[PDB]
Write a protein of this length. Structure first.
Ligand SMILES: Cc1cccc(-c2nn3c(c2-c2ccc(F)cc2)CCC3)n1
Length: 301
C-alpha cells in the first residue's frame, strides 16, 4: 500500500549501498532508498535495525517503512523515510557557514542521536544498545530547524545485554576508511566487546565535530569546508594510508589555536581531543558529550 502510492521525483542519493530518491506520498515529500533484489541482505538488515528496535528519536532519521515493492519483472526493495531538503551535514557544511548557535545545535543533536543509539533500555519493551559503525558527515542529515538526525544504520550492531552477545550484521563491506577508529585501522579492536564499537563511534563523531567547528563563522573568519585529514591523505584513502597517519604518526585533524578565543569553540575543541585518544577506554561517552553540550547550550540561549 505504501510503496505503490509513492511517486519518485529525483535522485538525491549516493551510490555505495543502494540509491536514494526524493518522493511524493499523499502530498508529502518523502525519501526512498531503493535496493535491487540482489542487494537484498543489506536491505533487510537496515530495515531490521530501524524496526526491531524502539529507535524513535528526533535525532535519528524518521523511518517510515520497508516494502518489498514487487514488480512482476524485477521486484525492488524500498526503504522509506522522512525527507530532508538540506541533505547531508556534509552538503550543509559545504554550502553554508554557521553561527556559534548553529554549531551547538548541530553538535548537540548529533550527540543526542548517538547517545540514544548507544543507550540500552533493559526489560519488557526495552531498546538494545546499538553501535553505528559508519558515522560520518554524509550519514547525518540536517533538518529544516537546524538540527541533525543520524542516518544509514545498515552496518549497526545491536547488543544483547542478556546473553552479552552481539547481533552481527549480514553484509560484505565495513565502514568508511577515513573515519575508521585507530583500533579498527590497525585491526586491534576486540570485535567481541560491544563497548569497543561505541568507543569507535565517539572517535568518528569527534571528526564530525571538527568539520562543523571549522565552519563556525565569527567576525567573518572561518576556514573552508574540509574532510578530516584532508591535509594528510588522498581522496578515497586506503586502510594502509589512514593507519600510517593515524596510528604510526599518531596524527589527528588540526585544531586552530584561534578556537580558544571563543568559549564554545574551546568546549568543542576539548571534546574533540577527548574523542581522539588512541585508547578507546579514555574517550568520552556520547551521553557525557550531550550533557556538556547541553550545559553550553543553556548558557548561549
Ligand atoms: C532508512 C532510509 C530511507 C530513505 C533514505 C535513507 C538515507 N540513507 N542515507 C541517506 C539517506 C537520505 C535520507 C533523507 C533524504 F532526504 C536524503 C537521503 C544519506 C546517506 C545514507 N535512509
Amino acid at each position: 500500500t505504501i510503496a505503490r502510492t509513492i511517486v519518485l521525483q529525483e535522485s538525491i542519493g549516493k551510490g555505495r549501498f543502494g540509491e536514494v530518491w526524493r518522493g511524493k506520498w499523499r502530498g508529502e515529500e518523502v525519501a526512498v532508498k531503493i535496493f535491487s533484489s540482489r542487494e537484498e541482505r543489506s536491505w533487510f538488515r537496515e530495515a531490521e535495525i530501524y524496526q526491531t528496535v524502539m529507535l524513535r528519536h528526533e535525532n535519528i532519521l524518521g523511518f517510515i517503512a520497508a516494502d518489498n515493492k514487487d514488480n512482476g519483472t524485477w521486484t525492488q526493495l524500498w526503504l522509506v523515510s522522512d525527507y530532508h531538503e538540506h541533505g547531508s551535514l556534509f552538503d550543509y557544511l559545504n554550502r553554508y557557514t554557521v553561527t556559534v548557535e548553529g554549531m551547538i545545535k548541530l553538535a548537540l543533536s548529533t550527540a543526542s542521536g548517538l547517545a540514544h543509539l548507544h543507550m540500552e533500555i533493559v526489560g519488557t519493551q526495552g531498546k538494545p544498545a546499538i553501535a553505528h559503525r559508519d558515522l560520518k558527515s554524509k550519514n547525518i542529515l540536517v533538518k529544516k530547524n537546524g538540527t541533525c538526525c543520524i542516518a544509514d544504520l545498515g552496518l549497526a550492531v545491536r547488543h544483547d545485554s542478556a546473553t552479552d552477545t552481539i547481533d552481527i550484521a549480514p553484509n560484505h563491506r565495513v565502514g568508511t576508511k577515513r573515519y575508521m577508529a585507530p583500533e579498527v585501522l590497525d585491526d586491534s579492536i576486540n570485535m567481541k566487546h560491544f563497548e569497543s564499537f561505541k568507543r569507535a563511534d565517539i572517535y568518528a563523531m569527534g571528526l564530525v565535530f571538527w568539520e562543523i567547528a571549522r565552519r563556525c563563522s565569527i567576525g567573518g573568519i572561518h576556514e573552508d569546508y574540509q574532510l578530516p585529514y584532508y591535509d594528510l591523505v588522498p581522496s578515497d584513502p586506503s586502510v594502509e594510508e589512514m593507519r600510517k597517519v593515524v596510528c604510526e604518526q599518531k596524527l589527528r585533524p588540526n585544531i586552530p589555536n584561534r578556537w580558544q578565543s571563543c568559549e564554545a569553540l574551546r568546549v568543542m575543541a576539548k571534546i574533540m581531543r577527548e574523542c581522539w585518544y588512541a585508547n578507546g577506554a579514555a574517550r568520552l561517552t556520547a551521553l557525557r558529550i550531550k550533557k556538556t553540550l547541553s550545559q553550553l547550550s543553556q548558557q548561549e540561549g
